[PDB]
Structure formats: structure tokens, C-alpha cells
Design a protein around this ligand. Structure first.
Ligand code: XV4
Ligand code: XV4
Lengths: 306, 306
């Protein structure tokens, strides 16, 4: 029992992290097979970095303008190219620690682990969600760009996130590993605004089931509701609409606990209108929305990887 | 910016995890150099465990009664012995992935990362604190025993925790790697009660400084307090006493921010008497107590390892 914000074990990813230096800019890269992926804003100087033309900036570089250090070992770069907002540096050596891996684009509401890095070195690992406004609520300092977000499925690392930007609200923005940003952000040195964020309703309900599964039931009631009556209250409280999709993939949890999805919706409604009256759920005084239904099943039944 | 509950990167520990089987009981062990460490209740049969005599049970075992699997590879046990609540299994092969490592016993209030495992395989990693009642608020299913908790300083893993027990309140109890329990718990199949828990006052204060550093200042006040007038209110609210040792360890954070420790104590005082009035701090509606001052400095300055 117990329920924690849990991250994937990070060993397959640590063995891929490297340092990339172009000029006086240093950040992190990802070494897979004979390729190193990093944020393209590594080729910027502080002046380019206000409104660069990256095509121009990259035409002006050669392979020798990029220093890639895998620990002590300096890797020799033999090619480079840009794919959207990421640079791809071809090196003369395949990474012997390359895991099985995929590149994946996640949707809003899905979670992943972030291995925050500096100068090529892991500093820590935490779990995050892609918010509905396509930002992430991260923990990132200067030098962290090029840290990756990932999931592990069985034996395979699925990379889904590379870090580029911090917004003025203190939240974070990035791309997938093909360099396409999540949301409407650009890799320039400008103050950029995110859309209004919303609560991931389906994850709140999943966490409510983790609660029940761990013996927190005080918030349950004898009532039920229709999906339409529930979304009416959801809009009032800045929650994402609940779909039938969403209802369905909560089925496993609903069945495990005996509580229909729309009974649990009725408890969320009363929690929303009445608050928590100084009580807690799974150790929190807020409705938590960064666990998916599969996160909840994984943890409340001990799925392993290797 | 941003502030998350961050665990250490887990790869140095992942490469030490193995599976141990005696009879039909399977759990996790830790392989360092040519020794495998695991909970001694692996030698129990389901009936032995209401109140076993482990010295009797172990004298009844031979090396061949232990199956140790490092993945596919079965390791030969060449010796065995018990140290308090852990078994030490001599194997004929030194682990090639053995990190620099220490064994450390931690105090209450200190934090560590847990690599939860099943059948030898990493499932996830999260950060915990040793509570003042010597329990941890973990997430552990059947099969998790022998999972370890740890810190990393530079290149060295300091193991501090090995998992054995779940208490009926849903929190967890275990040993150091010399097999001595934290708190008054024993490894048998009985309902065991932990003392009342208290809040780690020094960690709350550090976390208040993490807040300020990240731009949450709403809770600050013009006031100050004496360490004793502050400790009077704390006892009333089940907070641990603040010492001058604690005051001293908050020096760096106090200095980074410009806020004297006892000005911040006067802010914690008002939060306890008046609550947070529907506000949050660092995304939490409760006062968080599982960050030490050095967790806060590390994360808010990007300290790395290797
Ligand atoms: C790379 O490591 C870094 C990550 C960033 C630093 C602090 N915490 C983080 O997550 N990325 C940057 O510094 C990028 C560089 C651009 C060119 C891609 N810049 C931003 O994140 C950024 C720039 C501005 C800004 O311009 C004056 C105003 C306000 C916010 C802001 N953020
Ligand atoms: C080992 O893997 C397992 C870990 C434990 C199982 C479920 N969640 C966990 O953290 N450890 C145990 O099962 C131990 C074994 C003894 C022999 C050390 N037993 C308990 O944790 C335990 C037994 C009882 C109990 O009696 C049956 C009543 C109430 C609580 C409780 N906890």
C-alpha cells in the first residue's frame, strides 16, 4: 500500500546523456546509436538568441565548431543537421549503452519522467504531466536544456520530451525528439505566454480510485450522476470535459473497487462545490491531477520493467 | 525555477539489484562486491513468520537452499550468515557494476530515494523522509522487501534503508544495511504500531525558503520571534522543536534570501494559527516537510553527480 509520485528508473537514460558545447554555450545532448540530439539554440550567441535565423546560424558552423564530451571522452562529430528545433550531430561512434528506444509524442494529460541534467550529468529525476496548455511544471535551471522526458514500456525507452524554455510564470516548454514544440512556443529569448491551464479531470478521478484502493473513502457518497450533469460542474471549475473514452479507460479501476465511474464523478462534484473542509486525500489537501489511470494501476499492482 | 520532489538518478543502484529465492519465498537483494544482502525473513515459510527464531531457521539452511538470480545468470552461493535482520550471501562472483558505496544509518528528518523492486527488477523511484516516529511513507507491494533507499554524494552511493514491513496504518518500516531496524519494529507477521508522528519543523522552514527563492512570498510578514516563543506554538501543533543546530543549518538559505531564520519562524507561526486560507505554496495546500535544507540548496542550484 501507499501511493507516491513515482518516476521510472533512470539508468537506461543516464547512459545516454552527454555534454554539447558550441562556442560559449553549453547544454545537454542525448546520444543514441551514432547520433547526438540537442536543442538547436546551442548554436546561438547571446545576440543571435533574441530573434535568430537558425538556418543562417547553422550554415555558418562546421562539425569542428561542436564539442561533444561523453564523460572524459570527446566524441568526434562527422556531420550535423537540423530537424525543426533540434540539432542532430552525427559522431564517429555508436553509444555502446544505447537502449531499445522509440521517439514518441504524448498528448496532454499523459505523464513521463524527467531526468534533469547539467554539463551532461544527472542531477535528479521526477515525474511530470504535459499540462493541457502544453506546458510542464518542471524544476529546471540554467544549463538544463537538452534534458529529456521519457517513459519505459517493458524494455523500451520512449523519449517524448526535450527541454528548451522557461516561461515567465515559472513553467516550462519544450519539444519532442523530432524538434516540434508542444504548444505555441518558439525557441527565442522572449517572454512567451501559455494558454490558461485546466485540470486533467480523468487523472483526478484516477487518483480518487488510488485513494479508495488505499483506504481513503471519506469523500465517497451514495450518489451518482450523468456525464452531462458532471461536465456542467466541470466547466464551472476549470476542469477538462470528461469523455466516454475517458470513462472507458477508467473501467479497470472502477471494477477493482466496485465504484462506477459516474458514482465517482458524483463525489468529485461534491468535493468541487464543498471543498475538502480541512481533510486530506492520499496525503494531499488538493485534488491531484498528475497521475493517469495507468500510473495508478502500475503502482497499485507492481508492474516492473528491465 | 520550479520545485519538485526529486529523487536521485537510480542507475548505480539498478545495476546492483538481484533476486533471491529460498523455498517459495522470493524477494529482492542487493549485490555489492561478492556479497548479496537481503531481508532475513526470506528463509521463513508462511507458518514460520508469526514468531520465528531466525537463528534456528538459518542453522537449518545450507548454501544450496538459496537461489540468487542476476537476471538470467544464477549466482553460486558459497557462504551465508546473518547480521541482525539481514542475510549476507557469499557468492562466487564479484558484481562488475559495483559502485563506490558506503553504508549509513540516517537520523529522523533526513531524506533518501527508494528504488522499489520486484523479482529483482526496478519498478520505480521516489523520494521519502525518515519520519520522527521512524517510519517512512512509502509505496510497496508484496514482493518489494529488499528494495533499498539511498543517497548519492558525488560518485558514492550511501545506502541507508532496506525494506521489510508494512504497518497497519499503511506506512512502512525497515532496517539500515547492517540489519538494524529504524524504530521499535520487528520482522514478524504481526500488527505493529508506530508512535505518533510529528512534523519536521526544520524541513518545513527550508521548504518555505525554497518558496521565496521561487517567487512565493505571500506568507511572509514584518514580524519576528524568539526561538522559544516559536517553539511554544510549535509544540501546540505537533511540530518538532527547533534547535539552534537547526537554525544554523538554515544559514545558507537565510543568507541567499535575506530572511533571518526567526523572521521566517514568525511566518510559520502565523501559518499554523491561521492556516493557508485556500492558498497554496509551491503548488501545495499543506506545509511540506520532506525536503531538508540541503535538498533545497541542491535543487535550487543544480548540483550534479556522476
Ligand atoms: C537552457 O538550459 C535554458 C533553460 C531555462 C533556463 C532557466 N530555467 C530553464 O528552464 N533555456 C533558455 O534559457 C532559453 C534559451 C532560448 C533562446 C531557447 N530561454 C528561455 O527559457 C527564456 C527567455 C526569456 C525571456 O527573454 C528575455 C523573458 C522571460 C522568460 C524567458 N525565458
Ligand atoms: C515483503 O516483501 C513484504 C513487504 C510488505 C508487503 C505488503 N506491503 C509491504 O511493504 N513484507 C511482509 O509481508 C512482512 C513479512 C514479515 C515476516 C517481516 N510482513 C508485513 O509487512 C506485515 C504483516 C502484518 C500483519 O499480520 C499479518 C497485520 C498488520 C500489518 C502487517 N504487516
Amino acid at each position: 500500500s501507499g501511493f507516491r509520485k513515482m518516476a521510472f528508473p533512470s539508468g537506461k537514460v543516464e547512459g545516454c546523456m552527454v555534454q554539447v558545447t558550441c562556442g560559449t554555450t553549453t547544454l545537454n545532448g542525448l546520444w543514441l546509436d551514432d547520433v547526438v540530439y540537442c536543442p538547436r539554440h546551442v548554436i546561438c550567441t547571446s545576440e543571435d538568441m533574441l530573434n535568430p535565423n537558425y538556418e543562417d546560424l547553422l550554415i555558418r558552423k562546421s562539425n569542428h565548431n561542436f564539442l561533444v564530451q561523453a564523460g572524459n571522452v570527446q566524441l568526434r562529430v562527422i556531420g550535423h543537421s537540423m530537424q525543426n528545433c533540434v540539432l542532430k550531430l552525427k559522431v564517429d561512434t555508436a553509444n555502446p549503452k544505447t537502449p531499445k528506444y522509440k521517439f514518441v509524442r504524448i498528448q496532454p494529460g499523459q505523464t513521463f519522467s524527467v531526468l534533469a541534467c547539467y554539463n551532461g550529468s544527472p542531477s535528479g529525476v521526477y515525474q511530470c504531466a504535459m499540462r493541457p496548455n502544453f506546458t510542464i511544471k518542471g524544476s529546471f535551471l540554467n544549463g538544463s536544456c537538452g534534458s529529456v522526458g521519457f517513459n519505459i514500456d517493458y524494455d523500451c525507452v520512449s523519449f517524448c520530451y526535450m527541454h528548451h524554455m522557461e516561461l515567465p510564470t515559472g513553467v516550462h516548454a519544450g519539444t519532442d525528439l523530432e524538434g516540434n514544440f508542444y504548444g505555441p512556443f518558439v525557441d527565442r529569448q522572449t517572454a512567451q505566454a501559455a494558454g490558461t491551464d485546466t485540470t486533467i479531470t480523468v487523472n483526478v478521478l484516477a487518483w480518487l480510485y488510488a485513494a479508495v484502493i488505499n483506504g481513503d473513502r471519506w469523500f465517497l457518497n451514495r450518489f451518482t450522476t450523468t456525464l452531462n450533469d458532471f461536465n456542467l460542474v466541470a466547466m464551472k471549475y476549470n476542469y477538462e470535459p470528461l469523455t466516454q473514452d475517458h470513462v472507458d479507460i477508467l473501467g479497470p479501476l472502477s471494477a477493482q473497487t466496485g465504484i462506477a465511474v459516474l458514482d465517482m464523478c458524483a463525489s468529485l462534484k461534491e468535493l468541487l462545490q464543498n471543498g475538502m473542509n480541512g481533510r486530506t486525500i492520499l496525503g494531499s489537501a488538493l485534488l491531484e491531477d498528475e497521475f493517469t489511470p495507468f500510473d495508478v494501476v502500475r503502482q497499485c499492482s507492481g508492474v516492473t520493467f528491465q
